[PDB]
Amino acid sequence: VLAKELEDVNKWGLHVFRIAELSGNRPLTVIMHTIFQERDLLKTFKIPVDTLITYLMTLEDHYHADVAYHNNIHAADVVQSTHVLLSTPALEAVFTDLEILAAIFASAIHDVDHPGVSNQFLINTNSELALMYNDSSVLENHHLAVGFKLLQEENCDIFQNLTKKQRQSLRKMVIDIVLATDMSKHMNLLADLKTMVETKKLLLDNYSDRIQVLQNMVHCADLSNPTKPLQLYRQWTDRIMEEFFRQGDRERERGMEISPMCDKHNASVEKSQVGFIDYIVHPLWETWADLVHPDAQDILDTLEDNREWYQSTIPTEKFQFE
């Protein structure tokens, strides 16, 4: 049964692919709806249930089924991971229900309508998307537009019983969160959070500090694959690489320079994963674990066990460093 798998909704390491299969490819709808009930978000913001389901299905339908990694399973995973991260004891009673909703809704839409290729592929091919967004956070800008645009379809406005101020406030937060998922923003985000860990009171008594924690939270949820039970992590690696190698096949067909990690004929899958952890995932997830000491120690330890597992198996690093 599906229902019995959803009981793990509050735990790190939910059987997410299992839920994907059991709900008939509706992991984003079933998990988002569970969490909305679990958090009493339908009562608080008077979201009609039919309106919520209809929107969620709509949002899910706009994730591509042929995209290996950035599809509805990835989106459900980031939504659920943010739901767990919100519930850490060191952030207890820190966020309002509007900020809670924002981080969770921002996580839901954060990759909607992904074509399975990078911003630069879109930029180099003179895509209509890159032309509209002036080669700047092309997809991340797009994910937001599509996610907000989708509220306008029949019976999809889930924010209809929010006041003007609540919609303004929510809208600003969702934008600041999803635009922080752009990787060219990782270095400054980690730095800003590095500073907060050093001068913290936990209390956050202005918008700039509050959006900043919420930004990094969803960012860690986005970069959380390596911190998961290994049998799930392994599945995230098979999926991203399948997507990456496809862009490489596409770049190669077109006579383009093949991107970092996209060459199936020259792929150090294992070495790239240690590089992802060493350069990006671990440096961030360690700074999070400081902010919320010791709430993520087992998450941090799972990360180091996976890195060691991937190391043992070793029979783009320029890109990781920058």
Ligand X SMILES: COc1ccc(C(=O)Cc2c(Cl)cncc2Cl)c(OCC(=O)NCc2ccccc2)c1OC
Q: Considering the rule CB under 5 A, would residue 111 count as an interface residue with Mg ion?
A: yes
Q: Which does 202 bind (CB under 5 to 8 A by kind): Mg ion, a second copy, ligand X, none?
A: none
Token pair for residue 259? 């991107």
Q: Which one, of 174, 168, 52, lies nearest residue 103 by Cα?
A: 174
Q: Which helix (H) or strand (E) holds 62?
A: none
Q: Is 282 a catalytic residue?
A: no
The site that binds a second copy (CB under 8 A) totals a number of residues, namely: 30
Q: What is the C-alpha separation between 288 and 253, in angstroms, rounded?
A: 41
Contact between 90 and 295 (Cβ < 8 Å): yes
Based on its alpha-carbon atoms, the radius of gyration of the chain, rounded to whole angstroms, reads: 19
Q: Which does 261 bind (CB under 5 to 8 A by kind): ligand X, a second copy, Zn ion, none?
A: ligand X
Backbone angles phi, psi at 7, to 5 degrees: -65, -25
Residues 282-301 close enough to bind a second copy by CB under 8 A: 294, 297-298
Provide the minimum distance between the beta carbon of 181 and ligand X in the complex, in angstroms, as a whole number: 6
Please report, as ranges, the residues that interact with ligand X according to CB under 6 A: 118, 181, 183, 222-223, 225, 236-237, 240-241, 261, 272, 276, 280, 320
Q: How many angstroms from the chain centroid is the CA of residue 24?
A: 22
Provide the minimum distance between the beta carbon of 147 and a second copy in the complex, in angstroms, as a whole number: 22
Catalytic residue (choose from 62, 64, 70, 219): 70
Q: Considering the rule CB under 5 A, would residue 181 count as an interface residue with Mg ion?
A: yes
Q: Considering the rule CB under 8 A, would residue 3 count as an interface residue with a second copy?
A: yes
Longest CA–CA span in the chain (Å) reads: 58
In the complex with a second copy, which residue's Cβ is closer, 98 or 175? 98
Q: What is the C-alpha separation between 322 and 319, in angstroms, rounded?
A: 5
Provide the minimum distance between the beta carbon of 34 and a second copy in the complex, in angstroms, as a whole number: 8
Q: What is the C-alpha separation between 113 and 63, in angstroms, rounded?
A: 5
Q: Considering the rule CB under 8 A, would residue 42 count as an interface residue with a second copy?
A: yes
Q: What is the DSSP letter of 281?
A: I
Provide the minimum distance between the beta carbon of 54 and ligand X in the complex, in angstroms, as a whole number: 28
Choose one: 174-182, 201-209, 245-253, 265-273; the region binding Mg ion (CB under 5 A): 174-182
In the complex with a second copy, which residue's Cβ is closer, 54 or 118? 54
Q: Which does 111 bind (CB under 5 to 8 A by kind): ligand X, a second copy, Mg ion, none?
A: Mg ion
In the complex with Zn ion, which residue's Cβ is closer, 41 or 177? 177
Could you tell me how many residues make up the chain? 322
Contact between 73 and 54 (Cβ < 8 Å): no
Q: Which one, of 171, 185, 174, lies nearest residue 137 by Cα?
A: 185
Backbone angles phi, psi at 173, to 5 degrees: -65, -50
Q: How many angstroms from the chain centroid is the CA of residue 72?
A: 11
Token pair for residue 77? 């995973």
Amino acid at 313: T
In the complex with a second copy, which residue's Cβ is closer, 3 or 65? 3
Q: Which of 126, 154, 208, 315 touches a second copy (CB under 8 A)?
A: 315
Q: Is residue 276 marked as binding?
A: yes
Token pair for residue 257? 């320079």
Distance between terminal CA atoms of the chain?
46
Residues at the site binding a second copy, with contacts judged by CB under 8 A: 3, 7, 34, 37, 42-43, 46, 49, 89-90, 92-93, 161-166, 168, 230-231, 234, 294, 297-298, 308-309, 312-313, 315
Residues at the site binding Mg ion, with contacts judged by CB under 5 A: 111, 181
Residues at the site binding Zn ion, with contacts judged by CB under 5 A: 111, 222
Residues that constitute the known binding site: 70, 74, 110-111, 222, 225, 273, 276
Residues that constitute the known binding site for Mn(2+): 111
